[PDB]
Amino acid sequence: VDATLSRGGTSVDIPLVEEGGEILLSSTFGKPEVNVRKSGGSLNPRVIDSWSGLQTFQLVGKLYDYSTSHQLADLVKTASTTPLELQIPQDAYPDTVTVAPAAGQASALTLEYPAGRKDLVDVSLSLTRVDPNSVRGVGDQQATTPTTTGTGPVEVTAGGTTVQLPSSGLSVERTVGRPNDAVRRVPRQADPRYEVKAKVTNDVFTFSFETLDNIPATLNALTDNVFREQLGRDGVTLDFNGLLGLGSVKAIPVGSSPFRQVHQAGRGWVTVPTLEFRRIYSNE
Amino acid sequence: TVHIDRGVDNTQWFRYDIPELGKEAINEVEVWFDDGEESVIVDDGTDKLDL
């Protein structure tokens, strides 16, 4: 029923549960390092297989409290040379595999907190199988999610002005990954080497909502203070005020399309499909 | 004589590329001087013995 993901003392059980005929587990096997010749005077190429293969695990599940969700995010984001162990509840797998968060990806863990659902979180994990004895590194960096026991609106503070995000149709997605870790080929064995790096991680919060009332004032406050100002080295304070048990993080909107205002025919309100924030330097 | 008080903390770098450069290095120089009529050998014994 539950897959256990653990690192020493820290343990999270993810219920491998989903509706109907949805994919709970995908295990992809590969040989990224086979050299197949592009040319030569044969009909069929000569090949050489000399290196570790690839095994990628994709886990889809559901978590029944926010506390465990934050623990999972912290577990995935942490830089530590203590092996990360995955226990899969299926007989086609060994009892424990040693894993890295997806080898080069910004999105190893996705957590979705959708509208209408209470105490039910969507989990998507991507993990890469690494050699248990080849987890190498120097630094420990303990990831923490700031938590508080409030109830207040999601607040966005930039340049002395606070915007309160509409509760109406409000969804949150959190993406976590470790793209700066190196998973590397080794000769003569099945599984690659994991170089744990005490370096920059990916941590992104995405919001979706409908703006229903005081529409100009709400949207203009966000766009004027966040988008039309230069923020400098500092950024935006994103405060959950205890929603989902979350607190305050420093963030910035990144890229070409982090915010969209959508107007549909015959509607008296504005849709925000996406508002994206990446967590910036804070952690002493 | 001058120190940059700010420094580069572990959070303040974001790329690095640090070599030891040694492809040009030699251990003996002979200099002809005085219209080429006299010579002096400069002798780096350490590198010669280490090689």
């Binding site: 070409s256 399309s257 | 790329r15 590329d17």
Partner: peptide, 23 residues
């Protein structure tokens, strides 16, 4: 996005591009 020895060779031309006409 292209790198030689981890350093970017893409020119930081400050030119904008924005979503094409939808059709």
């Amino acid at each position: 996005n292209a790198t030689i020895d981890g350093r970017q060779i893409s020119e930081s031309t400050g030119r904008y591009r924005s979503d094409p006409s939808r059709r």
